[PDB]
């Protein structure tokens, strides 16, 4: 280990200090492949605005460009999508004005222009995804304004608005009230849409509690008539048509939560009644309508709040989350196949089991995400994974039968969380750079620091480098989003009086050469057992990657395409989920009818639609792209009759 040498001179001339102000920093990046960062210091009545365009090595003061006005961080730096170059800062105005004033730029923060508004805004301005000139905003008077010219001229499109948000093709959705305000009429609201910037309108829902969008689907919770309860309803067509979901109804204390979504399907958390602090994950079909209990006792706090649920973006099908035992202990579960099967994380080879474990030899890894952090454990960062860095998952954890309160070490996976190893002893902050070419790490310490750790071989061997003589009290890392750069920015302040500072290191001269057709190796994703013909078949297909060698030392590059190739497996029965009304009694068997449809199953089979209710007892897993193999031969059967059979119906 530790083979890289002649490294001190390589980092020294590329280390780039820059100092700011006496002891509220606020950092926003502006566009990919630009190097444009914007700092907003706030003294609390004074503000100061800075600007690099060389990945935070050197900045220049542009407080002058906003007429040195006090800016409200509450709204914060509203950055536009893509490389539109748009920045909008919301100024404080003296009380008793007609409306507020905003500082707006559409040229990567080179020339800001002042603009007074006809209203006082309550929220940050929302940039349409389709067109970067199109903004909307909700006033203090609960009024939805819209501007087509990058916030130049605003038109109030509706009078009483509780929540609004954009969709695809410049479509605005929003919720409105009548007699009272929002909190009073919560439940009695109605949901509008406008296709055309408030010219035309359509009441696409009524007696709404709230609404939301995930991937392809529009969701809306709807109160029942003569009841305090509500039910989720799903539109795949901007609310022209609706269908009630196959999920249970909940009271006003309970909540729903879109854990994750895409074109294929949605993970839906449904809170368990009685102030339990947990619920149940359900995964959808491609319709978004039929659901399927994925995970029981999924940990999720009171009144919304925090969960450990985590899309491991560095491998397809992988999600981590945390669950509560009957015991009242917390264990971390992993799914490798989009929440069909869940299970314990493999115990690291380089680890003994902690005091939580009954057995000293055998236990599992457990992960510190948002919940550990909320409960004030010594956890600087949640888990990290970049999709370009295939395989790589970095997180803090305990090794045992539950999450332990002790000061955790940092563990790493290189295969999407099948296997793990201790990366660094004790808590660190970490950032992936150049698509897994260089991992970088800073220690979390009570006292100040002057060194940075880096690994060219994906966490297996670390190299220490002193980046400063006069040390700093570290606060955070900043890298360019996308994790393709090699320009980390190390932020902190001097020993206590005190002031802000940022040492920025390029790693160009460390990875001196670019990579070649020899550096990459073949790597199968999801390798259970190579002796099996169907090894790596997740969601009906395999993927084999070209992956950077650990031993090899080179830049992947800013234009590094992740090279993979699919292999489409045969369809077994496992690639099909059971449609409504059917289940699996025996483990690994056929989908067969449940005899007693009870609870929200009975609710759906009565109150529903015959299209979803008639079925052969099988549907393809969403995102499952198998070919050939088994196809359900079984005859279709209408399930509404069996349910209504028992009821005496009116003539």
């Amino acid at each position: 280990c530790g083979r890289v040498r002649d490294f001190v001179a390589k980092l020294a001339n590329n280390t780039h200090q820059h100092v700011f102000d006496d002891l509220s920093v606020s950092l926003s990046w502006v566009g990919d492949s630009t190097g444009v960062i914007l700092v907003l210091t706030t003294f609390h009545g004074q503000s100061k605005l800075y600007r690099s365009e060389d990945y935070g090595k050197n900045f220049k003061d542009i407080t002058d460009l906003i007429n040195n006005t006090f800016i409200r961080t509450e709204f914060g730096m509203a950055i536009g999508p893509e490389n539109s170059g748009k920045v909008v800062l919301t100024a404080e105005v003296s009380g008793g004005s007609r409306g507020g004033r905003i500082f707006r730029s559409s040229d990567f923060a080179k020339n800001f222009v002042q603009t007074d508004l006809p209203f006082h805004p309550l929220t940050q301005m929302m940039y349409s995804p389709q067109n970067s000139d199109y903004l909307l905003a909700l006033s203090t008077e609960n009024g939805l304004w819209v501007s087509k010219n990058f916030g130049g001229k605003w038109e109030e499109i509706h009078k009483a608005v509780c929540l609004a948000k954009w969709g695809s093709d410049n479509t605005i959705f929003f919720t409105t009230y009548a007699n009272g305000s929002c909190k009073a009429d919560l439940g009695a609201l109605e949901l509008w849409r406008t296709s055309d910037l408030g010219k035309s309108f359509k009441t696409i829902g009524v007696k709404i509690y709230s609404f939301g969008l995930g991937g392809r689907f529009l969701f809306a919770s709807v109160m029942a008539d003569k009841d305090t309860t509500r039910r989720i309803h799903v539109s795949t067509d901007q609310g022209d048509t609706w269908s009630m979901a196959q999920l249970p109804s909940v009271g006003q204390e309970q909540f729903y939560s879109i854990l994750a979504a895409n074109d294929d399907m949605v993970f839906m958390h449904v809170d368990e009644p009685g102030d339990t602090g947990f619920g149940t994950i359900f995964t959808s079909d491609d319709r978004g309508i039929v659901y399927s209990k994925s995970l029981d006792r999924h940990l999720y706090t009171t009144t919304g709040g925090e969960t450990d649920f985590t899309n491991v973006t560095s491998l397809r099908g992988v999600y981590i989350t945390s669950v509560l035992s009957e015991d009242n202990s917390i264990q971390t579960m992993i799914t490798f196949d989009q929440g069909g099967r869940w299970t314990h994380l493999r115990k690291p080879e380089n680890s003994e089991c902690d005091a939580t474990a009954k057995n000293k030899n055998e236990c599992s890894l457990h992960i510190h995400a948002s919940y550990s952090i909320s409960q004030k454990l010594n956890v600087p960062m949640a888990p990290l994974s970049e999709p370009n860095a295939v395989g790589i998952v970095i997180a803090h954890g305990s090794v045992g039968d539950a999450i332990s309160v002790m000061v955790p070490d940092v563990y790493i996976s290189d295969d999407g969380g099948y296997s793990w190893t201790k990366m660094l002893e004790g808590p660190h902050y970490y950032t992936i750079l150049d698509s897994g070419g260089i991992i970088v790490a800073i220690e979390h310490s009570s006292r100040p620091i002057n060194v940075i750790k880096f690994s060219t071989d994906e966490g297996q061997c670390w190299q220490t480098y002193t980046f400063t003589r006069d040390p700093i009290y570290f606060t955070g890392l900043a890298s360019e989003p996308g994790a393709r750069s090699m320009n980390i920015s190390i932020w902190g302040f001097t020993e206590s009086t005190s002031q802000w500072v940022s040492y920025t290191i390029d790693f160009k001269d460390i990875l001196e050469r670019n990579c070649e057709e020899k550096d990459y190796t073949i790597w199968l994703a999801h390798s259970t057992d190579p002796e099996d013909y169907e090894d790596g078949c997740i969601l009906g297909y395999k993927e084999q990657f070209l992956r950077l060698r650990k031993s090899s030392v080179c830049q992947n590059g800013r234009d590094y395409v992740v090279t993979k190739q699919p292999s489409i497996c045969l369809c077994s029965l496992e690639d099909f989920l059971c449609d409504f009304g059917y289940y699996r009694p025996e483990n690994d068997s056929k989908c067969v009818e449940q005899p007693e449809l009870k609870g929200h199953d009975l609710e759906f089979c009565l109150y529903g639609r015959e299209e979803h209710l008639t079925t052969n007892g099988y549907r393809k897993i969403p995102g499952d792209k198998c070919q050939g193999g088994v196809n359900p031969v079984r005859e279709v059967k209408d399930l509404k009759k069996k349910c209504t059979s028992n009821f005496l119906s009116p003539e």
Binding site: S26, S257, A478
Partner: peptide, 11 residues
């Protein structure tokens, strides 16, 4: 020190 960035919509 803050460096803002997908929130989970609650219904």
């Amino acid at each position: 020190w803050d460096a803002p960035l997908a929130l989970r919509p609650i219904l």
